[PDB]
């Protein structure tokens, strides 16, 4: 199932997020992991993202709708910074 992960976090947490999501998705460029995970895989990916702890800045995308988002500062209708 076609999901997409972008990481907006800071180092060294961003390398940890790269290690967790890079086991599940292939990396495209400037932190937008892209590919296909089944829904239980997204659920356990959410579980290890929770077990990463605080400081995670990840917004997922199932097409246009946000499938999940752990940690945020400002994310309006558009999603720009």
């Amino acid at each position: 199932m076609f999901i997409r992960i972008k990481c907006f976090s800071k180092q060294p947490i961003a390398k940890k997020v790269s290690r967790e999501v890079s086991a599940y998705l292939e990396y495209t460029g400037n932190n937008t992991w892209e590919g296909h995970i089944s829904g239980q895989g997204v659920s356990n990916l959410q579980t290890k993202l929770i077990n990463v702890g605080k400081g995670v800045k990840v917004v997922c995308n199932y097409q246009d709708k946000v499938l999940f988002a752990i940690g945020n500062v400002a994310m309006s209708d558009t999603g720009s910074v």
Binding site: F2, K15, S18, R19, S22, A23, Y24, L25, E26, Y27, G35, H36, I37, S38, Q40, G41, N44, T47, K48, N51
Partner: protein, 289 residues
């Protein structure tokens, strides 16, 4: 803690060439000869099928085999695949697999199911254009493969049953999409080098169906003179006639490169859940008892 996705939940794949599957911050990265590291999705990879010039690191092999991504060598008679072994596979499926391999009447039925799963992959993975899936020239070849595999009186009887199916598919794809390339391994072009790194990708989604769900490559469905390579080659031939050769023929007809054919094969295996279909299809024949 960290239950992880199964091999029937892994959709990414890779058939790396001139690479170096090393350890890079815990991620199994296939670092090609250009100077960049393709970070393979290690937990979601079916396999990383190596080609010429590839050196798989030991810790990278540990991370690949622990997550059920069984790396293989491609450069078929001699293609040895290192199936994952520390993570113990389904014991209920594997115990009944030998009971459906030692009994010759049951070995015939298991071989018939494992070779008629190719007919079940040309109708499930319906992402086949150009030669279509109901054009009565490739569908006729799949039906002839199913008719040959339906009897399956011995493992040495229909030992090269997948070879005739692959030859018919490669002949019909060339006769349809304006080509004349035959079944060769050293005919260096955009066609015969497409279904030699595409069949290696078909063995990519076959080494994850025998390292977690299925039993082993030792007890094969086809044995004989032209049936050397293992049961991984009998699990790849389910996906070779539907997701490897049609994608290679479409990439050759469209003038695509080998990398575009590899991306098309990986995306067609991910979207149709072909690795998941292979993992959940080996468990159907093995754990039928």
């Amino acid at each position: 803690m960290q239950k992880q996705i199964l091999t029937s939940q892994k959709r990414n794949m890779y058939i790396l060439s001139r690479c170096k599957v090393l350890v890079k911050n815990g991620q199994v990265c296939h670092l090609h000869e250009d100077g960049n590291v393709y970070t393979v999705p290690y937990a979601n990879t079916v396999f990383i099928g190596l080609a010429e010039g590839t050196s798989i690191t030991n810790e990278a092999m540990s991370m690949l085999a622990a997550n059920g991504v069984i790396v293989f060598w491609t450069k078929a008679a001699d293609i040895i695949c290192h199936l994952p072994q520390a993570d113990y596979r389904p014991t209920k499926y594997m115990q009944n697999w030998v009971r459906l391999w030692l009994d010759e009447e049951k070995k015939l039925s298991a071989a018939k199911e494992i070779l008629k799963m190719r007919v079940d992959s040309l109708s499930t993975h319906v992402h086949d254009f150009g030669v279509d899936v109901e054009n009565k020239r490739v569908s006729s070849i799949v039906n002839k493969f199913d008719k040959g595999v339906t009897q399956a009186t011995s493992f040495e009887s229909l030992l090269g049953h997948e070879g005739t199916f692959v030859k018919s598919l490669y002949k019909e794809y060339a006769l349809e999409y304006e080509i004349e390339f035959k079944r060769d391994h050293k005919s260096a072009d955009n066609y015969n080098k497409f279904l030699t790194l595409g069949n290696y990708y078909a063995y990519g989604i076959a080494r994850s169906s025998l390292w977690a769900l299925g039993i082993d490559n030792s007890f094969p469905l086809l044995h004989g003179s032209t049936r050397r390579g293992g049961l991984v080659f009998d699990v790849a031939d389910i996906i070779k006639t539907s997701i490897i050769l049609p994608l290679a023929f479409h990439a050759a007809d469209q003038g695509m490169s080998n990398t575009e054919f590899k991306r098309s094969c990986v995306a067609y295996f991910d979207k149709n859940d072909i690795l998941a279909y292979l993992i959940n299809n080996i468990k159907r024949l093995c754990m039928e008892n």
